[PDB]
């Protein structure tokens, strides 16, 4: 397929890999309804669709189209296949374990499906729970039962319990234990063979909040280490926390931000310490080149590189801290500007 | 597509008719063995001649914090080395981190050290070095008052105590009376916080506080959060009177007419369309940091805790101890820009409205900082 430039012809995650692969200036084609210069990519996070946006071939030319990608039917790409561009186009396919995760607090639920490269929010449930009146607890109780019923209904439609290896329930208080009991009662009452088969796969965890970032708390929980440690999403949580442990020991051994990591790379500072983000997929060619180079640079020496997926909470967190960070091998003193807002 | 009310032709907040005194808000801190508890009781008792409420010719609603105007620490006279070392120390830190600038320090039980002025000065120092040197209080906002909770200099200098041999200052009550509260908050634009929301007969009921301004029956309230409005159908002020209005400081239980229940959530602030509350995506804040494990990085995700609203935010560093910085460690001031991860939230500057501008920051389960909002974006 690949001489020296070319083209390639080729799971819902594979739409994501492609989103990363695609670049403005590229050309591709497949079936649609009525070959384009790629100008816009649009990934519906939820997550069937990939929308790619003019007509660069025969027309039985110079007018916009949009592709709306299919998942099993194939397509054809198109001059500079980057080292990054190639490690994704090569990743999946060829592939290799899905996880359901419900983060809740009292009137709040986040229903997530998690894979190696993706965390997707299937349902947010946000209901107002009236407070307990010191003489009356009805409005609270009725509000609480509507909520229990709501997440139940949601997971029961969102989750396919044959596919997932684990479904986690996590809350700060009693909600997650209350739910586990509620789920399986109702599923025994009504006859729901799907869930009753899956009881062994459910784990109930502590969590500080019912907000999504709480996902970095678990899936690092010891109780779930056994079943999950070989996943990308846990690997990202580890490294990030490894990064934090060092920040904590010596703030001269943990850098973050573009101008900081580059600087660190000019020195010998960089080691088991590339924490880099898929979100470096800019359209400016000049500025794509440098990240590919840096990753190549640390890769040609024997130091790990971690390209976090911007979809995970871990990855989101890495983005907030401008999407590069690095641990260091020695303590370095400096004072660099970082070029942002 | 929506169409605003508008207002009726009704009354003006006629609070002033019945000559009211400013209601000043306190939090009272101190060890269990400072006479903190006796001091309050003795104030109740002596004002007895002539949540805890004392009036003089101001009115002191004292409360707890573990949103309010001033504070006092009280402590005691024993073998003083070790304590000062409780978690009254952390209380002092918290109050600074939040708005509070003025403390009164009740120096209790000097009668037990025979009203010795050298003892009062000794302890004034140990305390001044913690409240001033180590925590950010100005010397001129920390007032010291000698006392005996088992009747002292709290109400009347009308003691012929050995104390008034050397001591020329005010009584505790007078030291409190010299602290200037916010001018006339019942006049400032209306801010009403929502504590709870639930359906009723021909109204959605809301309960909460009048954070500033005033509110009366048959008026229009605006909810910046759901972009919706309502008619006040009833107002239960403090007790359960046949009240028809409420003013800044009163807890309220309202009944709202032309609004549906789901368009009104705890943590919302309602107001008039005139000088409405502003909902923002991000703000600037002066936080102050506590004992924390890892430092707060610029870009960190924390959970902000304001009223009933607790929500996920990211914090970007502007400056730390007035210098540019890449991390904010324990026991440090910082100017920061905080962004909500979950949409637009309504708030005020702490200048305008403490209870609406003072918040707490936490990381996983640990609280790591507190601050005041200084700017809206």
From Swiss-Prot, chain A:
InterPro entries: eFR1_2_sf, eRF1_1_Pelota, eRF1_2, eRF1_3, Pelota/DOM34_N, Ribosomal_eL30-like_sf, Transl-rel_pelota. It comes from Schizosaccharomyces pombe (strain 972 / ATCC 24843). This is Protein dom34. It is found in: Cytoplasm. Gene3D superfamilies: 3.30.1330.30, eRF1 domain 2, Pelota, domain A. One of its GO terms (cellular component) is cytoplasm. Keywords: Cell cycle, Cell division, Cytoplasm, Meiosis, Metal-binding, Mitosis. SUPFAM superfamilies: Dom34/Pelota N-terminal domain-like, L30e-like, Translational machinery components. Component of the Dom34-Hbs1 complex, a complex that recognizes stalled ribosomes and triggers the No-Go Decay (NGD) pathway. In the Dom34-Hbs1 complex, dom34 recognizes ribosomes stalled at the 3' end of an mRNA and engages stalled ribosomes by destabilizing mRNA in the mRNA channel. Following ribosome-binding, the Dom34-Hbs1 complex promotes the disassembly of stalled ribosomes, followed by degradation of damaged mRNAs as part of the NGD pathway. GO terms for molecular function: GTPase regulator activity; metal ion binding; translation release factor activity. Its cofactor is a divalent metal cation. Belongs to the eukaryotic release factor 1 family. Pelota subfamily. It comes from the Eukaryota. One of its GO terms (biological process) is nonfunctional rRNA decay. Pfam families: eRF1_1, eRF1_2, eRF1_3.
Curated annotation (Swiss-Prot), chain B:
GO terms for cellular component: cytosol; Dom34-Hbs1 complex. Its main location: cytoplasm. Residues 53-56 are annotated as: G3. GO terms for biological process: cytoplasmic translational termination; endoplasmic reticulum unfolded protein response; nuclear-transcribed mRNA catabolic process, no-go decay; regulation of translation; translation. Residues 21-186 form the tr-type G domain. Its EC number is 3.6.5.-. GTPase component of the Dom34-Hbs1 complex, a complex that recognizes stalled ribosomes and triggers the No-Go Decay (NGD) pathway. The Dom34-Hbs1 complex recognizes ribosomes stalled at the 3' end of an mRNA and engages stalled ribosomes by destabilizing mRNA in the mRNA channel. Following ribosome-binding, the Pelota-HBS1L complex promotes the disassembly of stalled ribosomes, followed by degradation of damaged mRNAs as part of the NGD pathway. Belongs to the TRAFAC class translation factor GTPase superfamily. Classic translation factor GTPase family. Component of the Dom34-Hbs1 complex, also named Pelota-HBS1L complex, composed of dom34 and hbs1. This is Elongation factor 1 alpha-like protein. It comes from Schizosaccharomyces pombe (strain 972 / ATCC 24843). The lineage of its organism: Eukaryota, Fungi, Dikarya, Ascomycota, Taphrinomycotina. The gene is hbs1. The chain holds residues 155 to 592 of 592 of the full protein.
């Amino acid at each position: 397929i690949e001489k020296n430039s070319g083209w390639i012809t080729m799971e819902p995650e594979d739409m994501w890999h492609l989103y990363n692969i695609l670049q403005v200036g590229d050309q591709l084609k497949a079936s649609t309804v009525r070959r384009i210069l790629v100008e816009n990519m649009d990934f519906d996070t939820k997550a069937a669709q990939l929308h790619i946006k003019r007509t660069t071939e025969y027309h039985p030319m110079g007018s916009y189209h949009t592709l709306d990608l299919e998942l099993h039917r194939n397509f054809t790409l198109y001059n500079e296949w980057d080292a990054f561009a190639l490690d994704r186009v090569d990743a999946a396919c060829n592939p290799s374990a899905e996880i359901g995760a419900v983060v809740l607090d009292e009137g709040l639920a986040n229903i997530c499906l998690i894979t190696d490269y993706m965390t997707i929010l299937r349902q947010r449930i946000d209901q107002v729970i009236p407070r307990k009146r010191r003489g009356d607890s009805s409005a609270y109780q009725k509000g609480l039962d509507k909520f229990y019923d709501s997440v139940f209904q949601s997971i029961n439609s969102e989750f396919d319990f044959d596919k997932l290896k684990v479904v986690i329930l996590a809350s700060p208080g009693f909600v997650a234990r209350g739910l586990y009991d509620y789920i399986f009662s109702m599923a025994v009452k009504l006859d729901l063979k799907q869930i009753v088969k899956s009881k062994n796969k459910f784990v109930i965890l502590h969590s500080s909040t019912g907000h999504i970032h709480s996902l970095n708390e678990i899936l690092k929980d010891p109780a779930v280490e056994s079943k999950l440690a070989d996943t990308k999403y846990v690997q990202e949580i580890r490294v990030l926390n490894k990064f934090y442990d060092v920040m904590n020991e010596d703030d001269r051994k943990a850098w973050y931000g573009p101008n900081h990591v580059l600087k660190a790379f000019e020195l010998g500072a960089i080691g088991e310490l590339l924490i880099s983000d898929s979100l470096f997929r800019s359209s400016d060619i000049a500025t794509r080149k440098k990240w590919v180079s840096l990753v190549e640079g640390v890769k040609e020496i024997n130091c790990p590189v971690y390209i976090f997926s911007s979809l995970h909470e871990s990855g989101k967190q890495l983005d907030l801290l401008s999407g590069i960070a690095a641990i260091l091998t020695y303590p370095v003193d400096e004072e660099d500007i970082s070029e942002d807002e | 597509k929506k169409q605003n009310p508008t207002d009726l032709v009704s009354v003006p907040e006629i609070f002033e008719q019945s000559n009211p005194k400013p209601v000043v808000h306190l939090v009272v801190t101190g060890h269990v063995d400072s006479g903190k508890s006796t001091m309050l009781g003795r104030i109740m008792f002596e004002l007895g001649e002539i949540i805890g409420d004392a009036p003089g010719h101001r009115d002191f609603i004292s409360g707890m914090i573990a949103a309010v105007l001033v504070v006092d620490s009280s402590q005691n006279n024993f073998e003083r080395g070790f304590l000062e070392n409780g978690q009254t120390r952390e209380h002092a830190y918290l109050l600074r981190a939040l708005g509070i600038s003025e403390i009164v320090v009740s120096v209790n039980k000097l009668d037990l050290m025979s009203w010795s002025e050298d003892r009062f000065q000794e302890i004034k120092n140990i305390v001044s070095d913690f409240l001033i040197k180590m925590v950010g209080f100005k010397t001129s906002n920390v007032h010291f008052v000698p006392i005996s909770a088992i009747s002292g200099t709290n109400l009347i200098q009308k003691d012929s105590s050995d104390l008034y041999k050397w001591y020329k200052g005010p009584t505790l009550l007078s030291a409190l009376d010299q602290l200037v509260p916010p001018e006339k908050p019942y006049r400032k634009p209306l801010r009403l916080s929502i504590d709870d929301v639930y359906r009723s007969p021909r109204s959605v009921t809301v309960t909460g506080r009048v954070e500033a301004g005033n509110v009366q029956v048959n008026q229009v309230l605006y909810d910046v959060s759901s972009q919706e409005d309502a008619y006040v159908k009833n107002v239960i002020r403090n007790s359960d009177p046949s009240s028809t209005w409420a003013v800044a400081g009163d807890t309220v239980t309202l009944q709202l007419a032309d609004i549906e229940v789901n368009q009104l959530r705890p943590g919302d602030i309602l107001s008039n369309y005139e000088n409405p509350v502003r909902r923002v995506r991000s703000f600037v804040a002066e936080i102050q940091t506590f004992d924390i494990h890892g430092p707060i990085l610029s870009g960190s995700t924390l959970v902000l805790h304001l009223g009933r609203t607790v929500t996920s935010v990211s914090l970007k560093i502007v400056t730390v101890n007035n210098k540019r910085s890449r991390h904010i460690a324990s026991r440090k001031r910082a100017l920061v820009r905080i962004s909500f991860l979950d949409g637009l939230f309504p708030l005020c500057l702490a200048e305008e409205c403490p209870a609406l501008g003072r918040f707490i920051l936490r990381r996983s389960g640990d609280t790591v900082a507190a601050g005041i909002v200084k700017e809206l974006c």
